[PDB]
Design a protein around this ligand. Structure first.
Ligand SMILES: [Ca+2]
Ligand SMILES: [Ca+2]
Lengths: 253, 253, 253, 253, 253, 253
């Protein structure tokens, strides 16, 4: 078997990928999402009740389908990154990255020694298909994609430095934490926040990195796609489920 | 503690209850549904991957919310009915009921001896809250509601007889199995099927029993509510999740 | 490896075994109960929210401890009995046994062909420890113990017939279903019910079979032990947990 | 989406398919087995500790791989068959089939009304991918494959009658139950048993049905393949795990 | 929906709240404990085998009942605190707090930016009921309650400094870790230890914070209540289950 | 009850113990491995998809069998070590230990105050069998065994310093991470790497500590046993399963 090709990673340089946030934290819900045809599915280990084993179950469901999996761990924790890579997550979105130093450590956490600090356990891991991918330890690094989130004043204060870190493939901007960090908690729609988001996306793309964002607002999503944003999540499973059920009940109250 | 009051059962004689089909088979998804404000939630043990333990998890989630739980077991299996009552399901929807004899057996399956054949295990059961409901074995039968589904030619051929069974509180008509039994599999919208559904609802209400139905079609749902149908399910969680995600992706293809 | 000796089965003829009801339906709770020193633990598949997989987890917990496991399936279902024997349950308590014809079928359900109808699948089963017990298909039947419950008027109407079935090792009387069946639901304490229980125990022992019963009432339990009742369960984990927490809160209200 | 093509079913008429028994009852173990390259994987609901939900997880794992899933339910239970088809099992192996009448009922259990008695619930089912397979209710029957097991003297006494049942695609012979039924429990190797197996395979293929068998004995397996047996399982995951670990320890004792 | 009112937090200033430790690590066991009537239930993520998902299940169980949930995470880990607040835990008990600096970080961990460092993910969280609590991001901080444990000499050496931290609502003293830290491991009953506990409770209440403690000793528990201690846990589910089962067996040996 | 004797710990000074790696992450698979007769089983929390709850299930499975359990946590995390000791893991293998300062912290993490920093919670823990081991807080430390892994240049740079830490019972060398760290990723077989392994084993034994290693290569494993290596793991469950299934399929292609 040749290593699973990371089409998400390749597509960062060739197209704009449309994404769905997967927070229902369940192999069955992840499979329903995997049937729709999103370019990428964000399995949320930070804001949904997931652990290594529930994320594994969702990778297995989604694996039969074209949609590429991206895993957001709870934090840039090196051992947890080691766990998620070995279960076969090929793209990670690291929350709350605030310095070049922290971004380089995340690069190392995703690469085998001697170049990085990823723990070696290929015989045991879905990632190597238990060594059925015969050359895994030689070929793994090529198909790993590292994304970091900038979501604080300190991250924005270190944006140019993070953007010069080799091995950061993309910077994702989450309007929720960023709006809140800027003193507009719950109101990312403010001009002050939007101007900072647009400038940030411009700087990201100017430095040759992929820019990413989430917006459930169709107008803002299409605006971010007009700027060339490479990976745009356009909704959240929990929100779509809740709103579709509320909208239906309102027709009957 | 007094026994949990079955408001679904009481409401069969006082209003028209709007329902959501719960087939995501998960305590977390059941809780999202429980927040919307449906009158009733159908926990589907027949067509969703549920077992006694996953149904228990969904009863526990939903229990904090006003929405009344209805459990559809996989079949009119007496021991399985015993299990679902002891985990605290107070309303059951029995699929594929086709005779007075089978309907009376389902009544007995829901009532303690000597009047019925429900196995006695109150010390162990969430239903008695492990005997924290001190009078449970005296008061349980009052708050149990039995619904049966008519979904075959044989059931329609035995409708008058089922409708004279004391302890059948309601007859639910599932257009899917009924359309299929009538040779219009996948097309319940045919006039031949709809005329049979309307006549069936009329006969059900004429015999003093509650009529129920499911339709994701808003026009048919409101038509069934205009006829006085007592319990109408207006959608399905799996369908709302899939369609909301497909509709959103179509705005971006 | 030699097959696990069924000490419960042997002790039916040499001593009186003290039992605890396990309805907390969980490997971790079953292990707590396993530490106490009960002669037997009844893993309740009829009145607690258990399936084959949760019962297997409880057998694995308990296996490190001297306490012998007895499993009560939801009903005398031949395929379910097959499942529970293959996960390694060596003693079964069959609910709701009402005829010699039904007792004989339960005997066959527990014995391999050609003498019985137990499905053969030893390579796969914990019961054979996946063929690490090399002679399992030759030795299995010797260490299987079959108990049946008489809990209905019809059972009591067929008691002499059930007691002449070879391979029924014991008859358990559950006062809850029996009291209910006799029109004293929730009050097994009545003289009418108790006289029937005592006579029933006497007839069971007179026919050379083991008698069993459950009572959380210390006085009744010691009374049943004075009659020579071979297997006596003296409490229920769910009840002890609830009562201990209630008594404790009462000291501080 | 078009319905998943049942390649196992097609190959019954075009090649000889090599199978692995999957009784580790686990999505993770099922995925390891799925990477090997077996033509078919037998998810054992009869002799391994599986339920609908654990079988769903194993289907989801295996779905990303070419290996075709075959599910053996605990028994020819019509409601359980309904449940396994809806989670998306396209091939079923029914244990303990003993008459044409029982085989015909299993055929109907797998087909929608009006031809069959399969309960209709496509909106909810992974089988229809929650109606993302738009024609599912029209196209589903064509990709369903029904195998039955003959494992008793009564089955052998009804073999010609079972073989004339339209819609039985295959008869599988399990030497374990059959050897036991013939009074050679745990010694299927006996000439008396093997002559019966060979004759049975010849009769099955003579009637234009697929023959199937399991043998962990390489010689017997290759013999059955020389007879033209269409589906041959050649080992069992539990057995290969235990034996591989025992062989390794023996090199070091 | 308005945000769940944190009655535990309000009662810290108006009454003395009686608590039960919940370490059976199970939604079913948590629900049994929830029926008793304790003012608060301590879901122990530090000393019972719990993770985010098992704590969520226990929150869902308990939610239908008046008893207030308090969650003890394994350590003052900011990302884990983020995870427990989002699943909807409104009161946290932080183990092993030893400095004002650490207590201030725990305060911030529980509050949204710009005041605190709690990660923003309201669309996904049971805490916001998936934004069905429409003002959640504005109202969430008011219903969050932060308790810290002082259980080391260093903590006692920093007690006045921890007590001056705005946003620490309560200091809990666990005699087990504190007795051990003082060189009396497993004998918190010693006068040297008790004088320290009494003095500590007096200092905590003198600084206008709530004092808390656990003791299974009724006399010590009632003594701590006579001192005005605001939250007193009076037993542990694991201990009451084991002891109740041991006491019962001893009546029969 | 007396505390469980750690035979693994005792045997470090009296014999050479043969080990199997358990990465199938499942109570049912851990029990199959437990039947074989390995001296020790390594429950891998670093490279297999395990959490505290799945490790507890595997400890419960294995506990019925003579094989001693060793747990490898994901990292030398003090709170996680606390969790794993409380579920009853008596031998820990700490990955990625690189200094005497880190080894000493791991020693303290495994010992109660005042000598160590292990959090006290014996009422709640399987480790004390919920205080059924009456003297647990006095006797626990004697039966705890601490192993550390040297797997980096920095570890080898600190080997003499780590080897002088009292309370480090053993140093395990994992050829995978070490080979990788040395610039021979995936080829531990190189003379440069092997010479370092042999010298390392010699230095470990010269300092009075137990040496450990894993090799699936029979020749290397016997070589390590001839040097007197005290604990040698000779295979990996995931690898044996995959290889046994691959070899078997190869006979029939
Ligand atoms: Ca978990
Ligand atoms: Ca289950």
């Amino acid at each position: 078997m040749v290593n699973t090709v990371n089409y998400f990673k390749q597509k960062l340089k060739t197209e704009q990928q449309i994404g769905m946030w997967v927070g229902l934290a369940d192999g069955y819900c992840a499979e329903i999402a995997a049937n729709v045809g999103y370019d990428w599915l964000l399995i949320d280990g930070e804001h949904a009740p997931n652990d290594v084993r529930s994320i594994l179950a969702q990778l297995q469901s989604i694996a039969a389908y074209p949609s590429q999996a991206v895993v957001r761990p709870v934090s840039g924790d090196v051992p947890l990154i080691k766990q998620l890579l070995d279960i076969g997550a090929q793209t990670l979105l690291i929350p709350m990255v605030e310095s070049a130093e922290q971004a380089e450590l995340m690069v190392k956490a995703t690469r085998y020694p001697p170049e990085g600090i990823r723990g070696v356990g290929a015989a045991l891991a879905r990632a190597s298909r238990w060594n059925n991918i015969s050359d895994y330890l030689q070929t793994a690094d090529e198909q790993i994609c590292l994304l970091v989130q900038v979501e604080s004043k300190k991250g924005l204060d270190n944006l140019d430095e993070i953007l010069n870190v080799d091995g950061v493939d993309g910077i994702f901007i989450g309007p929720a934490d960023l709006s809140a960090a800027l003193g507009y908690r719950g109101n990312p729609g403010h001009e002050f926040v939007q101007n900072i988001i647009v400038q940030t996306i411009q700087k990201i793309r100017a430095a040759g990195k992929a820019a990413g964002i989430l917006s459930a607002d169709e107008k803002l999503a299409k605006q971010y796609l007009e700027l060339g944003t490479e990976f745009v999540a356009v909704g959240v499973d929990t929100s779509l489920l809740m709103k579709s059920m509320k909208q239906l009940l309102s027709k009957f109250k």
